[PDB]
Design a protein around this ligand. Structure first.
Ligand SMILES: [Mg+2]
Ligand SMILES: [Zn+2]
Lengths: 717, 237, 698, 21, 83, 63, 224
């Protein structure tokens, strides 16, 4: 649902109410109906409320970055003149209530209304199409309330303590109704560890197996539960069949729960459960009593001492620079490192000082907002202030925002903040331009066929083995391995097969593969599709937005482009290799990078020669070929650290990156075919893109890479 | 002063003892005023009978297990905590039940004196085995609300006495919710929805009637300052 | 729209225009803050839009040399002796000297107690240096800051971005009908209000002869008198109120320079852009979620936040080949209930209520000729209606506004006026409405926190203290620690201290925290106003000590504890909240982004000439732009029929438009979309470029 | 202060300003 | 179905609708064409009855044709052939 | 050429297409968006656009 | 405790009074206090001026020559009037004063059956040219009702609507003190502070709130 101002609804549905009221004989003719509508007669409102019966209406917010920027709701008449937005769909909209406005559209035809109702309904779009993580998340206030609800505070009121000889434990409770009665009085608190018998909730899998046996349903049998009453209340909001969780409800815990819910339950169920979670979190957020004053922002007592000790570390350095032993750049770097260490130590002291019940500590630890660096900037040590050119001022601030800045420290902080605020305006414009180019290049990639019956595919690393011998899970699995289709059977030690070909390759498939000891699997991707036009459904794999197999006519090219270019505004450069939006833009333009890295051409030992102003490299072939010499390797570049660190005379790979930086895609192409370029481009863009903490499935980039490599050149006429 | 729209009270039963009462339409702001008051008075006003203390032979200081039966004693405490009873006499009545040998001990084995009745004969209590003998004593008293365990004053006389938390209230759980139905042409009234779960001894209709009765008496106590004092009026029935 | 906006529009430094650089021409380096900006141009006051850094505001102490270069004053210290002689330096003259810190430990003899002092070096570097070699010092704190940012209390405790946005929202507050002075502020408010020019100031001293709402007669000492003619209910350039209420009596004496009357946003001659509202910082049931703000109905009922808004509607009758257009009541085919509030002269009676669609002036133009439909002839034959040879293009109230009329101004040639050549009547009508506060109106503090009104819930459903006073405005707690604007929490606590009053027990000497606290600040009556310079204000220890002793007003009730939080009772359920929350008086202001001037919708309005797309804007009937970026989203959804609908028939295809409207009115199925007209326009344009473009059926 | 009709605004300012704005 | 009752425009659950249709786009067109048929029947009720047959389920008081189409789809009262 | 001319360097691609006498197919996404035709994705393809609908025999017999 | 609660009175001041209700059930004190508080602050019938008319001025945004204030502040001054009426039909007040001096709320002439409880409130100030002639419309009502439109009714052009706040109750508060004894003899003792706006006694306001709530709960009691 979504709210809608009465006047705006009247103006939108003018012909609709016109007909619906001239039919009910309120107005004799159409002209009289128009006159009533413009005068806003009282009879108009009733028929207006009548005509909005199940009529979908689209809501949009400029800028519309990704697909979920337009959502079809159902409108409810509301007084005032403000469109009422559901709080959950804000994150998908990137909408905020500082004064942002929203545009409203009205579908007309039966086809248009059907498309709005079935395709673009808000309750049907929970998972983000980019990475698959839910976008209808319980947000800041809701997650704070849920976190406070399920905390297990030791030594609380009405705690369960065993006793003998004199009186029983007197902490156990019969039913959650009894627990609610006790909580209504002062005897029992919400976050007190107690023991309850439960009948309407499914016990966890291990308890179910140990006690209930094979027939372990929830509704009938009762079971002991060592939990808090708040956890019981929270679990009551989940669907009936869901097992009891009994966990501290951090943001990622709810993430796993809702992801599993969307994976293994119908869409209406997960929508209703998310609504229930929002309501419960909002109710408990106010009861949590999170509120901040100066007493809540305490300072570390050790800070001054630290701010003294490092100060001495500064002074001697300055004195040494006064002696001429340390140059200006050396002094600046030494001061920068000393003050970085001082900031880290002050942050550690602040962490060790803050109690875990402090409102700011639970705000940051709930996963709701901010990071501890923000609190350190609040109280303790602000940090290092940057320069307009991008350097670090050797004389940093020492106080913090809580203590109050002076004139000059505020001046330099303003320097840095103005730089940061100014860069974003250009950054987001460049992101929009990149998104437009990405949409234009991949517009021809749409699913046409269900399956192309190909055998070519893409190998994925999938938790390579450790030297000691074990299956260490690869960190990047939900990006590359998940949501694929196996191109070849996964068979261990030439024995039984574990996962057959053409499988969805979900979580059970993955942990089965890891248990079997298999690490290498070839999945069917879009880089090997045999369809002449577009990509087949099986090759594209599972669609992230719905979690099921992709449809037959879905336009995955535009979805990929929008997913790649949506979180582009969150990209930032580090402190001659670029690593921000310019880096990914130059990767997607297939141009020569600034930090060019020459690569080997023939397998063999190397010849390193320290030249003047520039180093020299010569790869001597292992066969009767020419000794390939690279000339322009300036002294600025550093030698690659691959395998001990590379040195002269070591055996190198046919396309080994000799010099640090970023290899040009054309060179690695003409040296190692198209597959190596696909691997390199995907890995580099993913490394640049996730260094900010942004997750995108690999096939979205794979579509663009395929569109890059579609064409071929001509050598002979 | 005529409200001009009579609020109504409509119920749709769900189970044998479960119902939802809907009250609509209401003067804006009154939904919470009625809802919270009804929710509190429902579980804190209706008189009811419940157990107060328990004693069983074979345990005097070992508050973990009792021989003959296999399950612990806290299970027995919970089971006879979840007993519905009706008593017409205010004195503590004594409940007895004695089973010999292997078998299933249920609440129906309780022998009630006249004036004390149990409405759940078929509730499991224990699983005796190995020619076990189990004798159970209960103390039943009537009152109101929900009272935690009360320490046994006669510890010396009754050392086997064990205090237990007591569900006096005949209703188990009531929740309330306020919606904002039908606001535009009827100046922003709201709807109250109450969901009630009571013990099978009494019906939710009677529970609501008694709660309304006691609340009406309590509020007419406040009204009995001016016999005539103009306010709101409701209308015909 | 308030005195501060007028003050800041002048004394503002721009960089675009003839001889300047455009925003596209502007690089990243220019937008940055130079070290020479200190004392000359404020580094905080600059708009957040594309023009960030391009345009700024002058400092508070800045001076313009007779040579065009900018220049700032600074005291000169000699051998560690601070002089009163004020000398003015430009940006280049600062490098060859060493200026000291604004707030330095001065001992009144010119000597800083420590040798090392924060100084600004030649290249803008800040560093330690012994005292004997420094030669200059700042004249005062808040020298680097402008006048719009000098009004922010506890500025030094705020992030630069939030201070920037707070300074920008100070510019766009609205003038309320009472304009209560702020409890916690800065000394710059008085000067800013005084020299803004919109408060009446007695030029010459003397006794007041007589006082009235329209005018004040003041008798000077030298016999003669002077009459200040007060300006009442004047429309500002942004359609706000500019009333001027005198604040003097019939027998008082006023000195030259004293404020005589208050402007729109001034109380007792000092700036007052908002109201003092009690604040609880708890997150309440999600109605204050994501920067949303909830208010009590007391503000609506007591008219605490309500603004008088005035609009003007010009309309001119001009000569035409058809003849002349008459401002007359001979308006064709109109009823009488809508003719009740017009004079025979043809315009609305003064003091009459109008609303959207009502007629304002009756101006009738000779229609000339057209195709009289035969159906029109049968129509007149059924009723005896005249042909009505003239066209009634009268002036009507545009969509979505109402209110009473304030004044009518009429000019005409027979009034021997200097009308433009061609027009011979011109009448302008002023309509005003007392716009109350509702949902969607933007409210903000002067510390960067902003938000729209999530809801206005009644006084019952408000958390109230043990005394029973309901809180007025509730803001979320999840924004302040992340967004780094903790200064306004300190403002809240200081405001509560200033409201409840305080006294520091000077029985056994002054306490340790109050040793540096000045006298006359150890005692404060209830509702006492305080001040805080932006960079030299109340410290944490002083504020904590003030919070410790906060004597109650009437009953014996210390509502807030030593740490600022207070117990408060829920108004919804009734039980007390489990944990105390911070409460206190905060200065809030209503911004000029009201929802009434921000809601727009259309079904079938006008269309453009070349392409048949509907126009855009609020003056015209508008229509939201469905750009290509939203086309990307709709294509990604896989919705094709919706996209084609939004493109062809809903926007472009003229026959499609009329057929769709007929079908929906007739209750018939919407027909098949046609071909967009803009594509045909493009085809003809491309053909005109000597490009043979033909579309082939097969 | 130094304004004839200035309301009594108590100030926390520590040092004095040699010149008025 | 263990879910609680749906409300508003989601009265026919979306997944039970997708159960009877290969893909959601086919479902959209399947609903739209039957909605057009329902509206055409409503227009031609008084005149000569054509091949189109109206709501096979009893409509409410007054209802959009699209909701009638969706309810008919959920009840398996219609058949469709993929292109 | 219609898609390319609406993306970047309009004059250059327009001149090149005029010289080459390039015959656009009007088949892609942006071309159909421009000319008002159904986009060739989602509910625009012939598999879904040409869905035949009719009630079952028992359902119409029960009418 | 098997007893029944009672109600007493403790009149500290002519308008502020305390009512003690004991014994209550554990936890019922807060809920009962809130239930009284909401209906006291919302649905206590009273009287307030709803529309004024001044002969000189035609609308709400000008000034009458002679007075220091303006009509848009005259209305703000008048909005704090405290009048009491017992007849439901509307009735007109009258204010008429010429010459210098401060016109106060006690200068208005009340017809039979209406009393002005704030005779000392400042309305405006006049001078030699001062001539004030105001007509007020007073009728009984409940709660806060915004200004009606003179075009909605058959109202003269000169009629000026005024926001109406019929609420004699100024502020209320509750506080309890539970016993919470181990001997299960726990009860709540509610203390309710009521202060009204000099129109009706706080006891009368509490009686009216009880009369407004008794039948609403009887709605539940009549189900059976
Ligand atoms: Mg925003
Ligand atoms: Zn394929």
């Amino acid at each position: 649902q979504c709210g809608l101002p009465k006047l705006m609804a009247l103006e939108l549905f003018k012909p609709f109410v016109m007909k619906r009221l001239v039919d009910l004989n309120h107005a004799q003719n159409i002209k009289s109906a128009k006159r009533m509508v413009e005068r806003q007669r009282p009879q108009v409102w009733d028929v207006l409320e009548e005509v909005i019966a199940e009529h979908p209406v689209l809501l949009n917010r400029a800028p519309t970055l990704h697909r979920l920027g337009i959502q079809a709701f159902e409108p409810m008449l509301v007084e005032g003149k403000a469109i009422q937005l559901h709080p959950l769909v804000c994150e998908a909209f990137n909408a905020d209530f500082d004064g942002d406005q929203m545009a409203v559209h009205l579908p007309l035809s039966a086809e248009a209304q059907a498309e709005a109702r079935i395709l673009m309904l808000s309750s049907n779009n929970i998972l983000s199409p980019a990475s698959g993580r839910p976008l209808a998340m319980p947000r800041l206030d809701m997650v704070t309330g849920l976190y406070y609800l399920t905390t297990e505070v030791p030594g609380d009121t009405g705690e369960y303590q065993p006793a003998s000889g004199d009186h029983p434990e007197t902490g156990v409770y019969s039913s959650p109704a009894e627990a609610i009665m006790a909580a209504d009085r002062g005897v029992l608190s919400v976050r007190a560890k107690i023991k309850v018998r439960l009948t309407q909730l499914r016990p966890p899998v291990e308890i179910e197996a140990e006690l209930f046996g094979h027939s372990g349903w929830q509704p009938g049998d009762a079971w002991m539960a060592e939990t808090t009453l708040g956890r019981v209340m929270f679990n009551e909001l989940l669907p009936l069949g869901y097992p009891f969780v009994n966990k501290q409800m951090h943001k990622k815990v709810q993430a796993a729960i809702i992801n599993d819910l969307a994976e293994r339950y119908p869409m209406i169920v997960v929508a209703q459960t998310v609504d229930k979670l929002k309501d419960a979190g909002f109710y408990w957020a106010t009861r949590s009593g999170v509120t901040v004053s100066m007493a809540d922002v305490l300072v570390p007592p050790r800070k001054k001492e630290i701010l003294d000790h490092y100060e001495e570390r500064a002074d001697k350095v300055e004195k040494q620079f006064q002696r001429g032993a340390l140059n200006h750049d050396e002094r600046n770097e030494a001061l920068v490192e000393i003050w970085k260490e001082a900031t880290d130590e002050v942050g550690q002291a602040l962490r060790e000082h803050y109690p875990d019940d402090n409102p700011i500590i639970t705000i940051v630890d709930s996963g709701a907002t901010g990071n501890f660096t923000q609190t350190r900037t609040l109280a303790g040590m602000k940090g290092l202030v940057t320069n307009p050119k991008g350097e670090f001022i050797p004389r940093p601030v020492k106080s913090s925002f809580r203590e109050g800045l002076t004139v000059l420290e505020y001046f330099i902080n303003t320097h840095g903040a103005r730089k940061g605020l100014a860069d974003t305006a250009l950054r987001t414009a460049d992101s929009g331009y990149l998104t437009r180019r990405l949409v234009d290049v991949s517009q021809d990639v749409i699913v046409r066929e269900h399956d192309c019956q190909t055998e070519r595919g893409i190998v994925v690393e999938l938790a390579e083995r450790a030297p000691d011998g074990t299956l260490i899970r690869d960190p990047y699995i939900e990006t590359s391995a998940y949501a694929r289709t196996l191109g070849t059977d996964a068979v261990d030690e030439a024995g039984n097969v574990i996962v057959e070909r053409g499988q969805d390759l979900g979580d059970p498939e993955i942990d089965a593969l890891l248990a079997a000891g298999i690490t290498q699997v070839k999945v069917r991707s879009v880089l090997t599709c045999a369809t002449s036009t577009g990509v087949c459904a099986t090759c594209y794999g599972r669609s992230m937005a719905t979690g099921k197999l992709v449809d037959i006519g879905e336009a995955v090219g535009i979805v990929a482009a929008q997913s790649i270019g949506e979180p582009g505004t969150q990209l930032t450069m580090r402190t001659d290799i670029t690593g921000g939006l310019p880096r990914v833009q130059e990767l997607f333009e297939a141009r020569v990078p600034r930090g060019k890295a020459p690569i080997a051409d023939v397998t063999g030992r190397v010849r390193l020669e320290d030249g003047e102003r520039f180093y020299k490299i010569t790869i001597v072939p292992d066969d009767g070929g020419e000794e390939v010499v690279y000339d322009k390797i300036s002294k600025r570049q550093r030698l690659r650290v691959f395998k001990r660190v590379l040195s002269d005379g070591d055996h190198v790979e046919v396309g080994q990156q000799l010099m640090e930086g970023s290899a040009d895609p054309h060179e690695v192409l003409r040296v190692q075919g198209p597959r190596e370029v696909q691997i390199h481009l995907v890995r580099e863009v993913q490394e640049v893109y996730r260094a900010q903490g942004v997750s995108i499935h690999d096939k979205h980039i794979e579509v663009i890479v395929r569109q890059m490599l579609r064409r071929v050149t001509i050598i002979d006429s | 002063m005529l409200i001009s729209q009579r609020p109504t009270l409509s119920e749709d039963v769900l189970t044998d003892n479960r119902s939802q009462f809907v009250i609509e339409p209401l003067e804006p702001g009154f939904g919470y005023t009625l809802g919270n008051s009804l929710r509190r008075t429902l579980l804190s006003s209706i008189p009811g009978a419940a157990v107060t203390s328990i004693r069983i032979d074979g345990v005097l200081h070992e508050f973990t297990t009792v021989p003959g039966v296999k399950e612990d004693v806290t299970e027995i405490i919970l089971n006879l905590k979840s007993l519905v009873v009706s008593s017409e006499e205010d004195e503590p009545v004594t409940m007895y039940l004695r089973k010999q040998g292997p078998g299933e001990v249920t609440a129906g084995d309780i022998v009630p004196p006249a004036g004390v009745t149990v409405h759940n004969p078929g509730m499991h209590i224990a699983t005796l085995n190995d020619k076990g003998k189990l004798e159970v004593e209960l103390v039943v008293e009537r009152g109101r609300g929900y009272v935690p365990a009360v320490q046994n004053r006669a510890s010396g006389a009754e050392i086997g006495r064990i205090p237990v938390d007591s569900i006096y209230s005949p209703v188990l759980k009531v929740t309330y919710k306020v919606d904002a139905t039908r606001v535009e042409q009827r100046t922003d009234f709201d709807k109250l929805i109450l969901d009630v779960e009571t013990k099978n001894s009494i019906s939710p209709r009677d529970a609501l009637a008694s709660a309304g009765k006691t609340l009406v008496e309590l509020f007419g106590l406040a009204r009995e300052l001016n016999v005539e004092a103009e306010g709101i009026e409701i209308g015909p029935s | 729209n308030n005195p501060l906006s007028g003050l800041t529009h002048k004394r503002r430094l721009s960089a675009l225009g003839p001889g300047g650089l455009s925003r596209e021409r502007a690089g990243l380096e220019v937008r940055d803050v130079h070290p020479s900006h200190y004392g000359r141009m404020c580094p905080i006051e600059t708009p957040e839009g594309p023009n960030i850094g391009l345009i700024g505001s002058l400092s508070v102490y800045a001076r313009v040399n007779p040579f065009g270069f900018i220049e700032t004053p600074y005291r000169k210290v000699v051998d560690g002796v601070v002089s009163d002689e004020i000398v003015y330096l430009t940006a280049d003259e600062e490098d060859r000297h060493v200026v000291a810190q604004a707030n330095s430990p001065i001992d009144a003899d010119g000597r800083f107690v420590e040798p090392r002092v924060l100084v600004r070096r030649k290249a803008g570097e800040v560093e330690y240096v012994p005292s004997s070699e420094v030669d200059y010092m700042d004249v005062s704190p808040r020298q680097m800051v402008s006048v719009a940012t000098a009004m922010i209390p506890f500025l030094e405790h705020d992030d630069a971005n939030r201070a920037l946005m707070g300074a920008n929202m100070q510019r766009q507050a609205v003038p309320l009908v009472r304009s209560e002075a702020p409890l916690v502020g800065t000394g710059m408010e008085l000067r800013a209000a005084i020299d803004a020019g919109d408060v009446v100031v007695a030029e010459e001293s003397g006794v007041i002869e007589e006082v009235s709402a329209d005018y004040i007669t003041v008798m000077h000492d030298n016999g003669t008198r002077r009459t200040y003619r007060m300006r009442k209910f004047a429309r500002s350039n942004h359609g706000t109120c500019a009333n001027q209420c005198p604040i003097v009596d019939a027998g008082d004496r006023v000195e030259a320079g004293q404020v005589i009357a208050d402007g729109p946003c001034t109380d007792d001659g000092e700036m007052a852009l908002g109201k003092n509202l009690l604040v609880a910082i708890m997150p309440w049931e999600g109605h204050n979620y994501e920067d949303a703000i909830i208010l009590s109905n007391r503000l609506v009922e007591e008219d605490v936040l309500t603004s008088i808004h005035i609009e003007e509607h010009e309309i001119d009758a001009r000569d035409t080949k058809l003849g002349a257009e008459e401002i007359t009541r001979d308006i064709p085919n109109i009823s009488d209930e809508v003719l009740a509030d017009l004079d025979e002269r043809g315009i609305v009676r003064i003091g009459a209520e109008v609303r959207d669609g009502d007629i304002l002036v009756g101006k009738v133009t000779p229609k000339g000729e057209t195709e009289l439909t035969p159906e029109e002839r049968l129509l007149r034959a059924i009723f005896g209606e005249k042909a009505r040879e003239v066209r009634d293009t009268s002036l009507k109230v545009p969509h979505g506004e109402s209110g009473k009329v304030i004044g009518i101004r009429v000019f005409s040639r027979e009034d021997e006026d200097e009308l433009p050549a061609g027009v011979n009547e011109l009448v302008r009508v002023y309509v005003a409405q007392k716009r109350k506060i509702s949902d969607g109106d933007k409210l903000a503090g002067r510390h960067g926190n902003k938000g729209v009104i999530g809801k206005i819930l009644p006084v019952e459903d408000m958390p109230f203290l043990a005394d029973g006073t309901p809180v007025d405005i509730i803001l979320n707690t999840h924004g302040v620690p992340r967004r780094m604007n903790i200064g306004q929490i300190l403002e809240t606590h200081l405001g509560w201290c200033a409201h409840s009053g305080w006294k520091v027990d000077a029985a056994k000497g002054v306490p340790d925290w109050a040793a540096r606290l000045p006298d006359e600040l150890l005692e404060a009556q209830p509702n006492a106003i305080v001040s805080t310079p932006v960079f030299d204000g109340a410290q944490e220890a002083e504020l904590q000590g003030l919070l410790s002793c906060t004597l109650p007003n009437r009953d014996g009730d210390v509502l807030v504890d030593a740490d600022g939080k207070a117990m408060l009772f829920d108004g919804r359920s009734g039980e007390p909240f489990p944990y105390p929350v911070t409460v206190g008086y905060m200065y809030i202001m209503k911004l000029h982004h009201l929802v009434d001037d921000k809601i727009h919708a259309r079904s079938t309005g006008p269309y453009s000439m070349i392409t048949q797309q509907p126009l855009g804007g609020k003056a015209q009937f508008g229509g939201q732009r469905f750009g290509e970026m939203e086309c990307w989203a709709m294509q990604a959804y896989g919705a094709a029929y919706t996209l084609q609908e939004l493109l062809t028939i809903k926007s472009d295809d003229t026959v499609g438009r009329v057929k769709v409207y007929e079908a929906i009115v007739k209750g018939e199925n919407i027909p098949e979309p046609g071909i967009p007209e803009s594509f045909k326009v493009l085809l003809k344009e491309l053909q005109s470029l000597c490009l043979n473009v033909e579309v082939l059926s097969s | 202060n130094s304004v004839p009709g200035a309301p009594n605004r108590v100030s926390f300012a520590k040092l004095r300003e040699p010149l008025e704005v | 179905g263990g879910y609680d009752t749906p409300l508003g425009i989601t009265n026919p659950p979306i997944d039970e609708l997708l159960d009877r249709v290969s893909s959601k786009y086919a479902l959209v067109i399947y609903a739209a064409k039957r909605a057009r048929q329902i509206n055409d029947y409503y227009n031609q009720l008084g005149e000569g009855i054509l091949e189109y047959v109206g709501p096979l389920v009893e409509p409410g008081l007054q209802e959009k044709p699209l909701s009638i189409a969706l309810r008919e789809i959920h009840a398996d009262l219609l058949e469709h052939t993929e292109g | 050429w219609l898609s390319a001319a609406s993306f970047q360097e309009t004059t250059r691609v327009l001149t090149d297409a005029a010289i080459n006498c390039r015959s656009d197919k009007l088949n892609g996404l942006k071309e159909n968006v421009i000319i008002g035709k159904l986009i060739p994705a989602g509910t625009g393809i012939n598999r879904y656009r040409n869905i035949a609908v009719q009630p079952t025999e028992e359902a119409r017999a029960a009418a």
